[model samples]
Target chain A: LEAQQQLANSEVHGQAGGGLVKVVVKGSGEVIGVTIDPKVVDPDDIETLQDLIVGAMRDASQQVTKMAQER
Target chain B: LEAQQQLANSEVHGQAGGGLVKVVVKGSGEVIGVTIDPKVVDPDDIETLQDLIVGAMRDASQQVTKMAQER
Candidate 1:
């Protein structure tokens, strides 16, 4: 559990176009913090905001993943 | 909307040290085909097993993120 706990503690943030989306990822396998740009919600393209949300987060995820590789 | 759908449908998997642990991750942001060897689980060293599990899955994740970049 400690090993798992350690991952959870390392928090990282990812944002899209600075203001469009912001996501907080706790390495513990959970997405925390702001997950979407509440203002960008478009009824015709509802998913765009979220896509940017996930994309932003994964952008950070991929960055950390490189470090995960070095380990 | 379509861009979001594309990611969800691209099923991908990650496995652990083969005989030790296994995991499945779907590009749709979920774990789908992941397999983990059930027998080698060590309660005394449960963390080790999970570490391997996380390791294997992330290994696959890293591979895909690279693939994502080229596209």
Candidate 2:
């Protein structure tokens, strides 16, 4: 149970676009933070940026699973 | 920490495109399930489907935060 508590409170990170986008999520699946590089921003191509963000978030979420599995 | 254990075991869901896409994630942000309607799939427009999937995931993650806040 202590391990579960620690896992629940822990943070996992993920990035995409060669680290142009970074995200942090709690073990509880709550997004705690996101960092987007300005170079990846495109006024006309918002979808690309959206893709990266989503990709980064997916990476972070996946990390949580990997960690849980390793435990 | 019983609540924490329960929260970690809990599942949150999200959908997009009029429920054309649905997603489920654990409280720890691990994606446990995804459901996509075949009618929404377009080979030439994969981006649209990807967008809906991401939207649904975002909705599910947001729900985790809301649930935590309510607690």
Estimate every model's Cα lDDT from 0 to 1. Answer: 0.53, 0.71
TM-score of each: 0.43, 0.53
lDDT of 1 by residue, B1-71 (tens): 56754775666655557535444455644434334354533345544543554466566676556556654
Q: How far is candidate 1 from the true structure (C-alpha RMSD, Å)?
A: 15.3
- What alpha-carbon RMSD in Å does predicted model 2 have with respect to the real structure? 8.9
Candidate 1 per-residue C-alpha lDDT over A1-71 given as tens digits, one digit per residue, 9 for 90 to 100: 55544664677776776757665556654444543444554444534543554456566676556545544
* Model 2: per-residue Cα lDDT over A1-71, one tens digit each: 57666797789999988897787778876666666666644445555655676678789878888988864
Stretches off by above 4 angstroms in model 1 are: A1-71, B1-5
Give the best candidate by DockQ: 2
Recovered fraction of real interface contacts per model: 0.00, 0.07
